[PDB]
Swiss-Prot record:
Motif (Nuclear localization signal): 16-19
Species annotation: Mokola virus (MOKV)
Oligomer status and interactors: Homotrimer when phosphorylated. This trimer is stabilized by binding to the L protein. Binds soluble protein N, and ribonucleocapsid. Interacts with host STAT1, STAT2 and PML.
Disulfide linkage: none
Protein name from the UniProt record: Phosphoprotein
Function, in words: Non catalytic polymerase cofactor and regulatory protein that plays a role in viral transcription and replication. Stabilizes the RNA polymerase L to the N-RNA template and binds the soluble protein N, preventing it from encapsidating non-genomic RNA. Also inhibits host IFN-alpha and IFN-beta signaling by binding and retaining phosphorylated STAT1 in the cytoplasm or by inhibiting the DNA binding of STAT1 in the nucleus.
Protein family per UniProt: Belongs to the lyssavirus protein P family.
Length: 107
């Protein structure tokens, strides 16, 4: 259901590469596939991200880069070695602010 909707959207973009702040100064690319996690575990972990329940319940577009960022920080040594961890945390916040605003904003 709600979790099923998150599972769908994640599955649909499973190998899709998003961009993140690198340890140095650039960016690097990462996808859900690279988490080496089951879809269930990823959905479970995605539920921790603020706004994900609300958006999925409406069938809206989920913040998948933000979601993947959060899950990667929480579960992935490799991602953590590759990333500016603090910068990703800030990036998580900015995505949430953007998507939550979209629910309130003019169309």
């Amino acid at each position: 259901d709600i979790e099923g909707e998150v599972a769908h959207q994640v599955a649909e973009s499973f190998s899709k590469k998003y961009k993140f702040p690198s340890r140095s100064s650039g960016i690097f690319l990462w996808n859900f596939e690279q988490l080496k996690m089951n879809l269930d575990d990823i959905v479970k972990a995605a539920m921790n991200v603020p706004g994900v329940e609300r958006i999925a319940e409406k069938g809206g577009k989920l913040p998948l880069r933000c979601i993947l960022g959060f899950v990667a920080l929480d579960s992935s040594k490799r991602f953590r070695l590759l990333a500016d961890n603090d910068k990703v945390a800030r990036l998580i916040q900015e995505d949430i602010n953007s998507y939550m605003a979209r629910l309130e904003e003019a169309e």
